Design a protein around this ligand. Structure first.
Ligand SMILES: *Cc1cc(C*)cc(C*)c1
Length: 12
């Protein structure tokens, strides 16, 4: 969390 996967999921 608060990583590139978190921000990719938030964007998607
Ligand atoms: C703290 C944080 C930052 C991003 C880019 C995304 C998430 C889910 C949390």
């Amino acid at each position: 969390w608060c990583d590139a996967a978190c921000c990719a999921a938030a964007k998607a």
